[PDB]
Amino acid sequence: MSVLPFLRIYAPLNAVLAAPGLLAVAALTIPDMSGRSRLALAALLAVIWGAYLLQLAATLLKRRAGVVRDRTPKIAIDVLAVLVPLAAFLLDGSPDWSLYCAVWLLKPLRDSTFFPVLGRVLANEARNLIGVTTLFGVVLFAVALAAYVIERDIQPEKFGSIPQAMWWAVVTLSTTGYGDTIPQSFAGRVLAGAVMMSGIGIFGLWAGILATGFYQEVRRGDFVRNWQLVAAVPLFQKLGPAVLVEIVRALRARTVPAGAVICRIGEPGDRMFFVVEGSVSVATPNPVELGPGAFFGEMALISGEPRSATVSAATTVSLLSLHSADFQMLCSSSPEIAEIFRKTALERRGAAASA
């Protein structure tokens, strides 16, 4: 709604660090044939590999570029990524040689978004993941035992043996349920339904676990981000605490590096633009070079049209889309900010014509 996390066109690593798994797995099998992809996909295997050389050395001289110390072991993550597959180059042994090759699949783990999520993975607390856990025990040995008496119900040939109760259990516990045989005695059935609603329910429980994980995460990181953002702009220094709250919790947006049409003029949209730092380019009959501490988008506001203007960043700028409800509420909260509203309209008045 208020966020604009635009990213410059980038081929992500995922293609390069993933591709090895893809071609490997491709030639990874022997569909009764000599080789094609072996030669090919092994070729792209020395290509990818060489990519892992060049990346590594990128760490050699980039071991410190002046780089932050935030995640130290990410490095080790990488180095193992390149290494374990090294000795994965080092086997002359049986075709299981080929098998080990996939170890790279850790590669996407080089870096990713899993960092903060894990941030509340340990910060989750939520022992009810444990209690639910032991409950997984509960159901598991529940149907395990009932399945014991039942599989032992009719002994004569296949039943009456522990394996059946085991497997029927395992799948039944699931939401998946896929298989060759059932109770010929209803009881095994009815209990089966029991384990359905049960094991499924508990599945849900762990769900709500992860759910609260999501929310708590998004909250914490979001509003703290709004810490970094609040102190980050001067006008926020001239505005008192309650307003600090309102914005900290209100401001939701991201930065848009240069190279993209940021908006669409006379096209429907709901959002707001603020110059955190830098300039931003504006098509106007009297073009206007933007700077920090001002705000764009009263174009659409006072003009009456959604995105009555458009802009483009020549320099990377951090954007903040203001919530216009609390804005109107400040306009009407005190006379000073009603003066702000008038003068703002006036700044679009002069901006829309004069220089």
In whole angstroms, how far apart are CA 37 and each of 40, 127, 158, 273, 324? 4, 49, 45, 51, 58
Does residue 214 touch its own copies according to CB under 8 A?
A: yes
Per-residue contact string for residues 97-136; x = within reach of K ion by CB under 5 A = ----------------------------------------
Which residue shows structure tokens 């040939």? 157
Nearest to 348 by CA among 292, 288, 306: 288
Which residue shows structure tokens 């009263």? 298
C-alpha dihedral (204, 205, 208, 209), degrees to nearest 10: -130
CB of 286 to its own copies, least distance (A): 25
CB of 129 to K ion, least distance (A): 24
Task: Find out whether 183 and 169 touch, Cβ atoms under 8 Å.
Answer: no
Instruction: Confirm whether residue 348 is marked as ligand binding.
Output: yes
What tokens were used for 67? 């780089």
* CB-nearest residue to K ion: 178
In the list 84, 99, 345, 346, the residue contacting its own copies (rule: CB under 8 A) is 99
Does residue 186 touch K ion according to CB under 5 A?
A: no
Q: Are strands 295-296 and 273-274 parallel, antiparallel or unpaired?
A: antiparallel
With CB under 8 A as the rule, give the number of residues binding its own copies: 103
Instruction: Confirm whether residue 199 is marked as ligand binding.
Output: no
Q: Please choose, out of 9-17, 35-43, 125-133, 175-183, the segment that lies near K ion by the rule CB under 5 A.
A: 175-183
Give the C-alpha separation, 49 to 54, whole Å: 9
Does residue 161 touch its own copies according to CB under 8 A?
A: yes
Helices 186-230 and 114-122, packing angle to 10 deg? 110
With CB under 5 A as the rule, give the number of residues binding K ion: 3
Nearer to its own copies among residue 90 and residue 149 (C-beta): 149
Positive or negative torsion for Cα 74, 78, 81, 83:
negative
**Residues 165-184 close enough to bind its own copies by CB under 8 A:** 166-167, 170-180, 182
Instruction: Confirm whether residue 298 is marked as ligand binding.
Output: yes
Does residue 178 touch K ion according to CB under 5 A?
A: yes
Instruction: Confirm whether residue 307 is marked as ligand binding.
Output: yes
Q: Where along the sequence are the contacts to K ion (CB under 5 A)?
A: 176-178
Which parts are annotated binding residues for 3',5'-cyclic AMP? Answer: 297-298, 307-308, 348
